[PDB]
């Protein structure tokens, strides 16, 4: 459990077809969770982060986006919005840590990034923690939007765009959101000593 | 594609009016609808927004006092006012703006609030 | 969170001339989220632009749409005396969506 691929990666995913990996049965340590530089926010809404080390848990999992500077505060577990409703939605009785990463010269070439994209379209709200790969047409009307785009039809997924000196906001902020789920079947440490 | 609107009027300060926006040929069940206020004299700003799901959207300032219910036997749009104040006399547009598009817009009423 | 200042707040131009009408936002925005529109006097607004990179549906394609950085600027081309009114731009991030005030067209 060395939480050194979520971090410290090369690559990393869309908000649509977000990546998630178990950290299931092996030594967890939390001591050097830290140390990534000054995150831009370390949010956590379950367990308290200093007593986060020690504690007993069960499997956890990491997941990995890439988030837009102004749209980083709808990871809270009841908002709304693109992010929040249409991607990426959390529940309600929450129990994880998100962490931002604040990057800005790692994820944004001079020319722009559009291998970076976020669904905008959506018929209906998500149910939280769930994967929504998607290539179909949206139909906005009383039309069938067969294989084609068109009036009333839209492409549902939409390029960031990530060009240097954008400011503080829209810059592509690495998310992580470790989870901590319990299942009543602890395989992970509750506190190295 | 086409889109009318009606149910205006003159209303009692703190008095709710019921304002209507219909469609024809555009599902609002899922759509990006929003709303905008003139103010006789001035420019345009927000006054709410519905998503294709259940979350809305308010200005800050008109924060409160605002409802936005979409129907689904019959493709029209409504909010309901409450609370009436006499600086939101404006006309409103019901819009379908898309964050890559701009719609189409409304003719409109005329909402005014005096004694 | 922001304002979107339109500068001039009037223009003077003759018919059958190039106009170039520019609206700067306070930060240092993205360009995919931000349109501009006409409004006819007492009349709906009609869509002009989207993305400040296009144009829209049942246009000539004369209205020049660009802009890169924070000074945003409409050139258009050729005009009509059907085509003489305001013009707004609107950013919509999503978590921040202003306004802008509209700058009256006349000879």
């Known amino acids: 459990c060395p939480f050194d691929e979520v971090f410290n990666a090369t690559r990393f995913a869309s908000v649509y077809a977000w990546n998630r990996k178990r950290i299931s049965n092996c030594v967890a340590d939390y001591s050097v969770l830290y140390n990534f530089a000054p995150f831009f926010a370390f949010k956590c809404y379950g367990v308290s982060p200093t007593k986060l080390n020690d504690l007993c848990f069960t499997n956890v999992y990491a997941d990995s986006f890439v988030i837009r500077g102004n749209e980083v505060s709808q990871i809270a577990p009841g908002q709304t919005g693109n992010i929040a409703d249409y991607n990426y939605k959390l529940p309600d009785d929450f129990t994880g840590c998100v962490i931002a990463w604040n990057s800005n010269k790692l994820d944004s070439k001079v020319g722009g990034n559009y291998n970076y994209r976020y669904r905008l379209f959506r018929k209906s709200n998500l149910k939280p923690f769930e994967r929504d790969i998607s290539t179909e047409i949206y139909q906005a009307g009383n039309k069938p939007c067969n294989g084609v785009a068109g009036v009333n039809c839209y492409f549902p997924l939409q390029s960031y765009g990530f060009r240097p000196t954008y400011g503080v906001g829209h810059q592509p902020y690495r998310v992580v959101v470790l989870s901590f789920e319990l299942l009543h079947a602890p395989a992970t440490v509750c506190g190295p000593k | 594609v086409q889109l009318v609107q009606s149910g205006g009027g003159l209303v009692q300060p703190g008095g709710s009016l019921r304002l209507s926006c219909a469609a024809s040929?555009?599902?609002?069940?899922?759509?990006?609808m929003n709303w905008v206020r003139q103010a006789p004299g001035k420019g345009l700003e927000w006054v709410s927004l519905?998503?294709?799901?259940?979350?809305?959207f308010y200005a800050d300032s008109v924060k409160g006092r605002f409802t936005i219910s979409r129907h689904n036997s019959n493709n029209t749009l409504y909010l309901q006012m409450n609370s009436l104040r006499p600086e939101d006399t404006a006309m409103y547009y019901c819009?379908?703006?898309?964050?890559?598009?701009?719609?189409?817009?409304?003719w409109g009423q005329g909402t005014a609030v005096t004694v | 969170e922001l304002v979107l200042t339109q500068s001039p707040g009037t223009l003077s131009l003759s018919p059958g001339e190039r106009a170039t009408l520019s609206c700067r936002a306070s930060?240092?925005?993205?360009?995919?989220?931000l349109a501009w529109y006409q409004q006819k006097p007492g009349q709906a607004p009609r869509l002009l632009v989207y993305?400040?990179?296009s144009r829209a549906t049942d246009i000539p394609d004369r209205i020049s749409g660009s802009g890169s950085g924070t000074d945003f600027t409409l050139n258009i081309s050729r005009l009509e005396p059907e085509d003489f009114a305001v013009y707004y731009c609107?950013?919509?991030?999503?978590?921040?969506?202003?306004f802008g005030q509209g700058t009256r067209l006349e000879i």
């Open positions: 819009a379908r703006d898309l964050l890559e598009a701009g719609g189409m817009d409304v």
């Open positions: 519905i998503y294709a799901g259940g979350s809305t």
């Open positions: 993305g400040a990179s």
């Open positions: 040929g555009i599902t609002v069940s899922a759509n990006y």
């Open positions: 930060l240092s925005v993205s360009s995919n989220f």
């Open positions: 609107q950013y919509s991030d999503g978590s921040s969506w202003t």
